[PDB]
Amino acid sequence: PLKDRRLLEVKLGELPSWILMRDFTPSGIAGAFQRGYYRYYNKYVNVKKGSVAGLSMVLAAYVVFNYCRSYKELKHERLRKYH
Amino acid sequence: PVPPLPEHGGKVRLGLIPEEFFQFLYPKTGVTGPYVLGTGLILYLLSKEIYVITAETFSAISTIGVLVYIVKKYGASIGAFADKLNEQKIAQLE
Amino acid sequence: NLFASFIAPTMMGLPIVTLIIMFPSLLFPTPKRLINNRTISIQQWLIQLTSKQMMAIHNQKGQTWSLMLMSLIMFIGSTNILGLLPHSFTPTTQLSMNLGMAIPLWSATVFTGFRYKTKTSLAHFLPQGTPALLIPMLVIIETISLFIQPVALAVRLTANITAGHLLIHLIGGATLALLNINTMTAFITFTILILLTILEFAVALIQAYVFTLLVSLYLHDNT
Amino acid sequence: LQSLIKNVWIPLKPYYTQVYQEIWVGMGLMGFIVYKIRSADKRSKALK
Amino acid sequence: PPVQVSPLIKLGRYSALFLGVAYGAKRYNYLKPRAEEERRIAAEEKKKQDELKRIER
Amino acid sequence: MPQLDTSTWFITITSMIMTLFILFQLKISNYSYP
Amino acid sequence: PFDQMTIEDLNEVFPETKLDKKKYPYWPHRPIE
Amino acid sequence: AQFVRNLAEKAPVLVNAAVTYSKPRLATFWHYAKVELVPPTPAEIPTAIQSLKKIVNSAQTGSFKQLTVKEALLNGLVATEVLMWFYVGEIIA
Amino acid sequence: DIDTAAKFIGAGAATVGVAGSGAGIGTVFGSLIIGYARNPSLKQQLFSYAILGFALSEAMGLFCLMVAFLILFAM
Amino acid sequence: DIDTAAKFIGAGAATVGVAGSGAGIGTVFGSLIIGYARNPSLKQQLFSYAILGFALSEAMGLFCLMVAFLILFA
Amino acid sequence: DIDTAAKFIGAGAATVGVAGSGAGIGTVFGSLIIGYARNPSLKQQLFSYAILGFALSEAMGLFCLMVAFLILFAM
Amino acid sequence: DIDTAAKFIGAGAATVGVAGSGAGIGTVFGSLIIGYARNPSLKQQLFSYAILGFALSEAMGLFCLMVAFLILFAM
Amino acid sequence: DIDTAAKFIGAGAATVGVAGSGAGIGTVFGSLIIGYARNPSLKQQLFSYAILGFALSEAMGLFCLMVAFLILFA
Amino acid sequence: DIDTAAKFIGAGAATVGVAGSGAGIGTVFGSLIIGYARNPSLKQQLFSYAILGFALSEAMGLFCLMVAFLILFAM
Amino acid sequence: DIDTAAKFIGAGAATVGVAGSGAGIGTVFGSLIIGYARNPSLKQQLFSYAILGFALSEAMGLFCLMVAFLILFA
């Protein structure tokens, strides 16, 4: 009953239908990053008894980010050659 | 003209990963699918050396040990601390 | 082999490192309701406190810089903590950032001191009623140890930070290497590492206070 | 850019004009110095 | 409260397990000699470099 | 000393500026009084 | 109530809590007594 | 000194208590793991092979292409689950 | 080799800047034990002003060790 | 090369300049402990008179390390 | 070998940081003597800060010493 | 030439005559702290007799710096 | 040999430290003097604390001398 | 020749002797600042003892400085 | 030669473990002064203690210098 649905709702056959019904302009990129931040915020943070997990996630994410950034310079000391 | 909040949002396992994952996975393996899933993910990363081990490993271990110590010892103290500040502003105004 | 962590990163040929710097900006969100959650109430209290404490001495004119000083100290206290993590980058140890954060402030203070209070600012070069035997040998010293302000004001912080990262890297490396030999030495050095880690958690804020306090009283003088 | 200016020029105006007149000069000096030093090292390595 | 396997997976698992066990033993056997010899010949090379710097210090 | 490979100084400085004199002066400018 | 309100709502209910912008144009819009 | 040694004796009692608390949680894990004391039955092999052939049927004609995402995501994640055991066997190797 | 031993020497020399810190440390702790012995009340601020100097001495101690390494391992 | 080994020697020697600063810093902050314990009603001025000296005595070793760097890389 | 020479020399001329330890020790034990002669009551708390200083100065001592034995031969 | 080598080394190990000025000024300013505490109405004369000391410490601590700069540029 | 020189060079330079012993014992018996001269009822107690500090710093210096020696007879 | 090397080395080394001068002078003025802080009916005699101590320390440093200049311009 | 200059400079270095003993003597005497100026009646014992401290510091310096003599004639 709807053209645009949550990408999980849509099927594989109409997969490209979803890919083409949606927009791509940078404004529609900010209007996505914002939605992500605000889902996280209003679901795990803006609550009267926020916990560690309300924060630890972004930290342990930034961690993996800056690990991926560094992969190149770390292929030079693998303790074993044939992995 | 503003909305209120819940009492506590999405509950979480290990303090890091959400549970909704677990339930979404309940139908097929139920309970002991996610844990072995992660164990395998990690033994894989380690085996093929997608994650080589060095000093920074132990640095991370130490920082994390410190942090969990701190929280598991001071958490609710800080929580009541903050709720106290809130009720205190409420009163000092009220 | 290990200055690596200070090398400026770009995952590819693009300008990334300007994102390692604005990330903290959102570990300190802004409130819109009157009451709010914990993570905001806490920092709010913290800031009320620290201001009421440090901006006491200053006169009324000098009380216009509260924003700048507390933002400075907040930014730096964030950066120097975050940099602790396993594989994170400290955008301060890039000496250039420290120079660009030090100089303008010191210069603008001196300029407020010489735009107004000209004779008196000039006078602070000669402590009151010193022996008239040595005047030049004193108004040389004061005027050389003035220009020395920003240089140290930056370099102190810079190298202070750097040394901790370097020391932890090296201790952990020797930890693994001794683990090759034996077990107990590794635990020795690991506990050593815990101590060092705490001490760095500490200096990383001590230096912020130092910095924005030096500046505060430099404004106290030349206001 | 209208949202940008209406987010970062309504509040931050009285600061850049009344107070911070004296820091921009310092930043110009900073630019002077960085130019000088980058030029010097560019020169010295152009040699080698 | 255990949840009975949707048998497809109970099948798919242990097969692959023993496949991997065989793969591992095979890799070990097939790989040992090549590395042994490359390292021993590199040892010849390093002894030669040692005597080189001995005579060409 | 990689703090002396001057190539990158311009961007580091400019971004430091952008941050220290824009974002925080927005956030902290909104904090409130008891 | 309180939690459903904002700072402007306090401007609304209590004008004496108002942080006036004339005698103290800057932040924190008042002195530190 | 001797008091620290006495504290160690109390710590040993505490360690026994730590073992005592761990065992019921472990017993719940054991209840899930107590299903098989011998290798699995070859009775449902028919069910599994037939489900496999039905998957092949859904595949060949191009009818499974009417699925929703979440289902295929789940399927692939459990596929990779099964997969990790291959590297596990390598570990044994 | 010669540059190597020279690095070694420069390192063994730069090691010594720690004595200022060791001194300042013992000094300020003595000062603290005293200012408490004759005023056991305001322990809190005494301890605060103890560690704030502790830090401002270890800073320079580690300046020196840092330059030592900076030479030894990375020129 | 000797012509640079000597640079290494000189810088490693001059490193130790800041030992006097280590001292002066510790000394001053102990004296501040004391003069705050005696008449606790002057913390303020007795702090403004301490970090001033901190600045002085740090500057006068940071100069020396700057000179070591200069000798090395110039 | 010249590197052997510079190694032994680095060890020696870097084993000097002990001066910090010594001076701070003297100063702390003296401050104890005095603060105690004044008030003989709080001996426990006083000796506590005393041990704090004792070990915290031996700290930098062993820092310097482990750096010495770090670059003695093993590097 | 090793001539310039030891010229450099001499400047470098001669600029050490400033830790004096360091500790001297530290002690001076602490003494001023106290002698202001016990007598807060002599501020003026006190600061003057403090500057008299700070100067003639800095001067004779700086002569070593100046000697290094000299011996290097000219001789 | 060149190294045979560095032997004695270092085994001699490895005693620069007893400076600490000097300054310590000085300050130590100074504070002891002042003690006995402000409250003579503590003589033995503070004498014990003094011999404590004495032994401590003397040991620091003398084990530094042992360092010197083990360098000598490497 | 290397004579210049060793002479520069020994001179820039011997010139350490001014550290003690700075330190002394500082301690002197500190003690004086105190003594006057408590007891201002002594200005003249105080200042006199002060100048005497200053001169003594400065001279015990001047000896080494002057003999360093000797070793340089003479040998 | 090589051992000649070696021992030369080894002793010229070990001869610096004396400034600490010197300053220690000085400080112990300053402390004696103050103590006496508080309690002018226990002069005798103050002085006994002080002369002992002098014996000790002088002993330490003399050993640090006997080191140098042995280096000379090792």
Numbering used by the authors:
A (entry chain Af): 5 to 87
B (entry chain Ab): 1 to 94
C (entry chain Aa): 4 to 226
D (entry chain Aj): 2 to 49
E (entry chain Ae): 2 to 58
F (entry chain A8): 1 to 34
G (entry chain Ad): 126 to 158
H (entry chain Ag): 1 to 93
Give the exact sentences the study uses for this entry.
The bovine structure shows that the structures of the membrane domains of porcine ATP synthases in a tetrameric complex have been seriously misinterpreted. The structure of the dimeric bovine ATP synthase is consistent with chemical cross-linking data, and the attribution of subunits is the same as in the dimeric yeast membrane domain. The bovine structure differs significantly from those of dimeric complexes in a tetrameric form of the closely related porcine enzyme where subunit j was misidentified as subunit k, and subunit k as a hypothetical protein. Also, porcine subunit j was built as a polyalanine α-helix in the central cavity of the c8-ring, whereas the cavity is most likely to be occupied by lipids (see below), and other differences occur in the structures of subunits b, c, e, f, g, and A6L. The central cavity of the c8-ring contains a poorly defined, noisy density observed also in the porcine and yeast c-rings (S13 A–E).
